[PDB]
Amino acid sequence: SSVVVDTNGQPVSNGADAYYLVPVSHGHAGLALAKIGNEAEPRAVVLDPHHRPGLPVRFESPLRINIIKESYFLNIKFGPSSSDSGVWDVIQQDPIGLAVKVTDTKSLLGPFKVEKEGEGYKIVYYPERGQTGLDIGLVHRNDKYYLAVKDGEPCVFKIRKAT
Template sequence: MRTSFLALCLLLFAFRAVSAIVDTDGEPVRNAGGAYYLVPVSKPNGGVGLGPVGNDNFPAVVLDANLTNVFPVRFAALERIGIISPSLYVGINFVLPSEEPAGWTVHAEFPIGWTVKVEQREIWGGPFRVRAANNGYKIVYYPERGATGAEVGIVYSGGYHRLVVKDGDPFIFKIKKATESTARIMSVV
């Protein structure tokens, strides 16, 4: 009986390790721990950051090729488990130098549609899931946490490559662990 229980535990651990979202080092992405850059697969430079678009109270989430406003993110699921998997609904929060909370939300914006923006609050168990896609990952938005979601893609508008809910052409990225040296590189370039 004891051997069967141990075998079952090992099997569950192996399944969980295979289904985990992993960073570029092959390490599982931690739930509410660690900070990670979202780096586009299609370009060697760039990352996800903030863009002050218009007179809006909520800054837009943008793809920044110049690395001037790129910040790491932290994924936060409500479940009390250590790693992020594709089945979890997560909040995505920027880790800013000011230490102010900056959680990703989605707002309707004419004429673009549903735009990913940042509010001054930390978001746990948000409306997003991270899914595997074409040698990387994509973000899928689930407004009602239902069975149907829409992919987050990129639209060029107002001088920025903005993240928007745009099913059919997702933003594909890799997840790179933010270390002290990568944070310096991202902020200097």
């Protein structure tokens, strides 16, 4: 029921604005793209020290309200607002596991919710909407931090408005 907000105290807009995800435990890490296995194009989302400020995201809910709540099912996407590229998804992939990846399709109701955690916010993945959720944490590999399912060990974010 609580509103998701930015660092300036303003409620997160619905698709309208992009926001940087600034981790509290990785001050020098921004959202970025990397390859996992034998992929030609980078489709996995990582926290990369070689990328500050990281890639900003947009929060989209089909509800025609201008703010984002904890209880809304959300799509998270890179790039422009109405585009279908850069949409986040969870895909079983070795050796990381339940890795956050990008696709070019946009479901009507996304599998993500933004929930309060510690001093900030966590991205919670629900395989389907009614279910129990899985916190997205970090899998340490290749001198970068792959965002992935790590229930009990959430990755904590601040949400910084793109300006």
